[PDB]
Amino acid sequence: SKEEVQSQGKNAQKILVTPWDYRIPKIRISTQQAETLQDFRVVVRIDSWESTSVYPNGHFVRVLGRIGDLE
RNA sequence: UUUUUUUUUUUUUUUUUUUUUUUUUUCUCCUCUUUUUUUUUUUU
């Protein structure tokens, strides 16, 4: 959310993403569009679980629809 | 009743060349609560 992105900097490489089912951990991905996609669902995948992190790493895949409209 | 003389617009043209997007950082990060997980069935 915004008040916790304006504090990430403005070139915040690393970012944390919240999944949609409670069964899945949170994922560490690196993007540079976080301050203009705070009203959309997105999609990611997974390449490698690393042990120097408590979470698994990822990377963005494609955009999805908008939060609020049935589509 | 007033003669004679005092040059002018730099000369030159017939020289070879075998490279190539970019370029250089920013750390670790507490996801709150009825559950085992329901399940046949038929009309698309």
Side-chain angles (χ1 to χ4, degrees):
Chain A
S1 87
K2 59 210 199 289
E3 280 78 38
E4 299 297 332
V5 70
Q6 65 182 358
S7 76
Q8 297 297 111
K10 277 203 162 178
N11 276 306
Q13 271 313 134
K14 300 318 162 301
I15 287 292
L16 273 195
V17 289
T18 187
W20 191 75
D21 56 6
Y22 284 90
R23 198 202 285 142
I24 287 305
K26 285 174 40 180
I27 285 183
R28 194 165 77 187
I29 66 157
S30 58
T31 186
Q32 292 274 129
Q33 192 180 29
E35 308 85 340
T36 183
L37 292 177
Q38 286 198 1
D39 190 74
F40 303 92
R41 315 270 197 207
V42 308
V43 173
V44 305
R45 63 184 183 270
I46 190 160
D47 63 358
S48 51
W49 202 309
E50 284 296 7
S51 54
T52 45
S53 86
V54 298
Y55 301 143
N57 309 290
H59 68 63
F60 182 80
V61 162
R62 271 310 160 200
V63 68
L64 288 178
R66 181 176 185 175
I67 313 163
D69 185 297
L70 187 75
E71 294 294 328

